[PDB]
Amino acid sequence: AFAGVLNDADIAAALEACKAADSFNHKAFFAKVGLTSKSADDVKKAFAIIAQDKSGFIEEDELKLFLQNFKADARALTDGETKTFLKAGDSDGDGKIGVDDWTALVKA
Amino acid sequence: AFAGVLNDADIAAALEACKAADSFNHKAFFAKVGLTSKSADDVKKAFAIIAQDKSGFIEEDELKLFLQNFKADARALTDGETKTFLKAGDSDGDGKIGVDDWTALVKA
Ligand SMILES: [Mg+2]
Ligand SMILES: [Mg+2]
């Protein structure tokens, strides 16, 4: 779903790098996919694409499927990767990731 | 210290991928650097080079500096990366990483 929003080579490359289960790192992915260098405004648009809503939240079970926003049939994150990802991103501690959580995490 | 054991292209790309603090992932690094696909025997050699010896162990403070085995002036791992690394790796529970710990973790 990031067709036109991020570089296709970047998306491919970010996915390639975490293809093996338990090899994902969100800080690595954000940089490689090209999100970290975007402005907070474009980071917000990226959130919207993923949560399907600027006011939405990414829940744990949806966070598990993070990669599949960039390539439909990418692997699922393992439960370990999801837990690590959620815990780093969920600053406001509601057990999920909203737009504020997200924007801070990408720019971190 | 791996000049001639691993490809220089591989070593540079593995380090490139985790150049940002807190972006390191050992499964990612081990595959990119080319350790995961080598024979256990070749994996044990890599351990003696790092640990200086087949009977040695990689302890916490040494693991912190894991990247500098591949490139002398590579960055130090943060305490978070290091704690994650040691926990994943230390199967025999002694709080450090020996050759059996290493071999199993590399081949995981
Ligand atoms: Mg939250
Ligand atoms: Mg041990």
UniProtKB/Swiss-Prot annotation, chains A, B:
Keywords per UniProt:
Acetylation, Calcium, Metal-binding, Muscle protein, Repeat
| A matching Pfam family | EF-hand_7
The positions annotated for binding Ca(2+) 2 are: D90, D92, D94, K96, D101
Q: Which protein family is it in?
A: Belongs to the parvalbumin family.
- Per UniProt, where does Ca(2+) 1 bind? A51, D53, S55, F57, E59, E62
Q: Which GO terms describe its molecular function?
A: calcium ion binding
Q: Which CDD domains match?
A: EFh_parvalbumin_beta
Another remark in the UniProt entry says:
This parvalbumin has an isoelectric point of 4.25.
Cross-referenced SUPFAM superfamilies, in alphabetical order? EF-hand
User: Which residues are modified to N-acetylalanine?
Assistant: A1
Its annotated function is as follows: In muscle, parvalbumin is thought to be involved in relaxation after contraction. It binds two calcium ions.
A GO cellular component annotation in the UniProt record? cytoplasm
Name the domain of life this protein comes from: Eukaryota
The protein depicted here goes by the name Parvalbumin beta
The EF-hand domain is annotated at 38-73, 77-108
Q: What is the lineage of its organism?
A: Eukaryota, Metazoa, Chordata, Craniata, Vertebrata
Keyword presence, Cytoplasm: no
